[PDB]
Amino acid sequence: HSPILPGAWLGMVGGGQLGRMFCFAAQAMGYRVAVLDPDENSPAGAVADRHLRAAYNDEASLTELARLCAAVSTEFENVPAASLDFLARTTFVSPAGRCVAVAQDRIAEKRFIASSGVTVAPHVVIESSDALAALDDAKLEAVLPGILKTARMGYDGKGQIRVRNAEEVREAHASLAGVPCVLEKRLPLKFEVSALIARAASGASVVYPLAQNTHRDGVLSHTIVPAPDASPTLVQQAQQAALQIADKLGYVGVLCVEFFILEDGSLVANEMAPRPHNSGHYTVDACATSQFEQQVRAMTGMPLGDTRQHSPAVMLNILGDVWFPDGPKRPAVTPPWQEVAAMPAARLHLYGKEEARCGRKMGHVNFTAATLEEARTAARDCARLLHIIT
Ligand SMILES: Nc1ncnc2c1ncn2[C@@H]1O[C@H](COP(=O)(O)OP(=O)(O)O)[C@@H](O)[C@H]1O
Ligand SMILES: [Mg+2]
Numbered sequence: 058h059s060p061i062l063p064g065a066w067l068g069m070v071g072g073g074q075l076g077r078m079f080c081f082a083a084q085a086m087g088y089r090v091a092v093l094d095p096d097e098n099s100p101a102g103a104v105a106d107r108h109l110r111a112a113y114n115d116e117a118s119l120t121e122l123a124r125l126c127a128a129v130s131t132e133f134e135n136v137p138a139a140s141l142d143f144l145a146r147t148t149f150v151s152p153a154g155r156c157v158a159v160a161q162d163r164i165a166e167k168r169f170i171a172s173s174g175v176t177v178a179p180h181v182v183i184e185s186s187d188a189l190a191a192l193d194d195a196k197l198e199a200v201l202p203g204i205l206k207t208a209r210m211g212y213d214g215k216g217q218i219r220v221r222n223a224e225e226v227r228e229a230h231a232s233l234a235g236v237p238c239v240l241e242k243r244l245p246l247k248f249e250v251s252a253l254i255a256r257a258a259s260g261a262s263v264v265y266p267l268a269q270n271t272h273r274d275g276v277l278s279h280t281i282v283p284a285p286d287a288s289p290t291l292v293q294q295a296q297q298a299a300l301q302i303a304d305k306l307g308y309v310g311v312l313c314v315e316f317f318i319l320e321d322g323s324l325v326a327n328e329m330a331p332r333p334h335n336s337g338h339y340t341v342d343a344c345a346t347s348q349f350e351q352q353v354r355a356m357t358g359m360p361l362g363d364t365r366q367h368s369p370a371v372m373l374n375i376l377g378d379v380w381f382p383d384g385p386k387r388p389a390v391t392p393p394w395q396e397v398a399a400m401p402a403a404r405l406h407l408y409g410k411e412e413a414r415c416g417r418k419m420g421h422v423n424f425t426a427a428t429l430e431e432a433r434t435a436a437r438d439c440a441r442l443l444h445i446i447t
């Protein structure tokens with residue numbers, strides 16, 4: 058892989074905020090970015106050097122992208138793997154379609170992570186309605202109460218149903234149109250962490266500090282780095298687990314592995330994203346090389362960057378709910394960005410999305426300071442200001 062050098066065209070399939078932040082990282086280093094995204098108002102397309110407005114399976118546009126670009130990546134975990142494989146006929150694609158196919162499918166993903174030597178949650182695979190019908194209630198009850206999750210196309214807790222007995226499992230599967238699913242035992246979670254790694258085609262890799270993540274209603278709310286409740290041993294285990302998965306997968310790119318720490322202290326792998334991750338946004342303001350720059354480096358065959366964290370950090374997600382302080386049925390109110398910007402620790406990142414909607418990710422604020430407790434305190438003050446907390 059002769060390295061792809063500054064000045065070249067780099068392709069990005071998907072045009073959300075992750076693709077937008079990739080654009081800034083690539084363009085700062087002198088690359089040009091072509092974004093393929095069907096939406097006219099794409100956050101990434103708005104800043105890309107070129108936006109191909111097309112469906113992710115459009116043959117002509119895929120051909121155009123691969124002809125223009127020396128290397129192509131994605132920011133969209135649910136992208137069709139066949140689109141990445143089509144692109145790889147004529148250009149370098151990182152991560153490869155085969156890797157994305159494993160990570161985007163909960164059944165394949167749990168099997169693969171287990172086969173890497175990493176513990177996953179107790180679960181029952183439900184391949185089809187016919188298969189579920191043949192399972193006895195005891196086999197379901199062994200992982201109940203639990204969560205029925207669609208194997209494909211879930212994000213932000215969607216495609217998931219709580220289930221408390223075998224009958225609810227069967228009704229839930231019908232409610233999900235009978236698609237393949239995983240039934241996971243609900244575990245007693247003490248805290249959640251994510252390991253962020255980048256891996257080059259050579260097998261070289263870098264790892265970030267462990268991020269400690271808090272979710273509300275299944276959506277990431279904030280991230281604290283380095284994880285205050287993760288001992289050096291656990292940090293080491295979680296990092297090695299992500300690297301073992303990435304090595305076995307032949308993964309080239311940025312990989313984020315989410316973990317549970319249970320009340321008994323055990324580490325359980327939840328899922329992985331074949332891309333930069335919401336819980337890695339802090340790297341932009343806290344680390345030498347951001348996760349977006351690692352994606353550039355991995356896909357170009359350039360050396361991976363240093364992951365040194367120069368400042369402790371907290372990321373606070375900004376959902377569209379913040380625009381509705383008087384409730385969703387009342388008019389939107391522009392959030393107090395002038396008061397956020399008056400906070401010394403605050404690094405404001407807004408995605409350029411036109412319409413604020415509840416549940417929609419509109420931005421994030423990174424808080425950096427000399428000490429983690431100063432950053433945590435600032436993020437709490439900002440959360441109260443925005444009515445994220447009381
Ligand atoms: N087996 C489980 N036990 C307990 N909590 C869980 C389990 N699976 C998921 N959760 C909770 O729900 C959140 C979202 O589930 P996850 O499968 O990660 O959804 P998504 O893929 O949409 O991000 C997790 O971060 C975790 O807090
Ligand atoms: Mg996944």
Ligand SMILES: [Mg+2]
Pocket residue numbers: 315328
């Ligand atoms: Mg998750």
